Amino acid sequence: AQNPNCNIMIFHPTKEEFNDFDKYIAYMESQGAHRAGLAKIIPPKEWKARETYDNISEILIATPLQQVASGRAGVFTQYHKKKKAMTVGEYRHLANSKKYQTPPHQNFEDLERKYWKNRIYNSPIYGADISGSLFDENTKQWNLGHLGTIQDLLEKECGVVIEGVNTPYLYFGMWKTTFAWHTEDMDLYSINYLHLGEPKTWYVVPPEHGQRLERLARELFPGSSRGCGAFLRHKVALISPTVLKENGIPFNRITQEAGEFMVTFPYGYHAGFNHGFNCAEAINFATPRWIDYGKMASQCSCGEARVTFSMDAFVRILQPERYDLWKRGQD
Ligand SMILES: O=C(O)CNC(=O)C(=O)O
Ligand SMILES: [Mg+2]
Ligand code: NI
Ligand SMILES: [Zn+2]
């Protein structure tokens, strides 16, 4: 068995190997990459996502989210308070202000220490979940707006034709902006490209151990757990690496830098934070190996998780027993 310790693997495809996205994903899995839940892909030196970022300040962040924490430094939830719209140029200036800017630090490890010590005492503003793309239309390799759709994968594997679309999302971050512990909708893959700016630190639990993280989360967030049998779908809970280590939960960590891709694999729980002003692009995708994960994915029916249009068909076809309850949650 490849990668039996579930380490995060880093790949360096050549320009030839970067042509065929599906083939490369299947290669990485042949080497055991999925066992970690997360992999890094460094593009060949010949590749670029677009020519420059000199012209992005006019993108609108219609609903910036202030991420307000409750709890203790290592175990907390965050809620998203909606803020007035602002442009990317306005948001970058805010990120760089004395109130929000990255503190002085020695290296990524020192910054990580400072994040876990101090996150809860601040409320950073995240421009998350913005439909759109920064890849040039002429970029033909690993262009996250030109991937094969999940609907087409389901159709190719299962023969069923369904409604829905699959488009990318932009994320504008600042110091301490946080993504809570989650797997993807329907335990899909994700791919995330860091277009510019400061790094993103990731934490990940191997898919084979995801239920260990779920059991700890039920213990740590007991009221939330009574409220919903899949409350990590709410994407509000944080648990630090120190707390994970104290409770014996297997995990790994890695820092993504500008110009790098990360792939999350089906049922790979992940969480993390931004180091400073940055911009990422991410999308969900599927492969044949996902189908079985999609069939078994948990679902929130309490009403909190509220998701896209396109998840309806996935539930309806892969999980027809759950469909009626899940749809009540959506309505
Ligand atoms: O970048 C972020 O804030 C969150 N991204 C992801 O969870 C992802 O790409 O799967
Ligand atoms: Mg612009
Ligand atoms: Ni994710
Ligand atoms: Zn729920």
Where along the chain do its domains lie?
1-331
Strand ranges (E), the chain: 9-11, 38-41, 60-61, 65-72, 75-82, 86-87, 125-131, 169-173, 178-182, 189-197, 200-205, 237-239, 252-256, 261-264, 269-274, 278-285
Residue 154: phi, psi to the nearest 5?
-60, -40
Q: Is 126 known to sit in a ligand binding site? A: yes
Integer Cα distance of 325 and 149 in angstroms:
26
Integer Cα distance of 25 and 18 in angstroms:
10
Ligand 1 pocket residue status of 203, Cβ below 6 Å = no
Q: How far is CA 8 from CA 180, 242, 304, in A?
A: 19, 19, 31
Residues with Cβ–ion distance below 5 A, ligand 3? 190
The alpha carbon of 167 and the centre of ligand 2 are apart by a number of angstroms equal to 19
Ligand 1 pocket residue status of 282, Cβ below 6 Å = yes
322 CB contacts (<8 Å, ≥6 apart)?
299, 301, 315
Sequence length of the chain is 331
Strand order in the sheet with 178-182: 178-182, 269-274, 200-205, 252-256
Topology of domain 1-331 in CATH is: Jelly Rolls (2.60.120)
- Residue 269's SS3 state is strand
End-to-end Cα, the chain, rounded Å: 44
- Contact (Cβ atoms closer than 8 angstroms) between residue 203 and residue 241: yes
With left for phi above 0 and alpha for psi between -120 and 50, is residue 307 left, alpha or beta? beta
Ligand 1 pocket residue status of 192, Cβ below 6 Å = yes
Integer Cα distance of 185 and 147 in angstroms:
18
Residue nearest to atom 4 of ligand 1 (CA): 179
- Residue 155's SS3 state is helix
Residue 303 CA: which ligand is closest? Answer: 4
Q: Looking at residue 243, what DSSP letter applies?
A: H
Integer Cα distance of 218 and 160 in angstroms:
36
Integer Cα distance of 113 and 122 in angstroms:
15
- Contact (Cβ atoms closer than 8 angstroms) between residue 118 and residue 127: no
- Contact (Cβ atoms closer than 8 angstroms) between residue 122 and residue 159: no
Ligand 1 pocket residue status of 238, Cβ below 6 Å = no
Continuous H helices in the chain:
21-30, 88-95, 108-118, 150-158, 210-220, 222-227, 241-246, 290-296, 311-318, 320-330
Ligand 1 atom nearest 182 alpha carbon = 7
Would you list the DSSP string of 19-35?
Answer: S-HHHHHHHHHHTTGGG
Ligand 1 pocket residue status of 91, Cβ below 6 Å = no
Q: Is 302 known to sit in a ligand binding site? A: yes
Resolution reached, in Å? 1.4
Q: Based on the number of CB atoms within 10 Å of its own CB, is 82 exposed (0-12), middle (13-18) or buried (19 or more)?
A: exposed
81: Cα within 13 Å, side-chain hemisphere? 8
- Contact (Cβ atoms closer than 8 angstroms) between residue 38 and residue 205: no
**Elucidation technique:** X-ray
51 CB contacts (<8 Å, ≥6 apart)?
136
Residue 202: phi, psi to the nearest 5?
-115, 145
Integer Cα distance of 181 and 232 in angstroms:
7
Single out the residue of 101, 107, 159 nearest to residue 125, CA to CA: 101
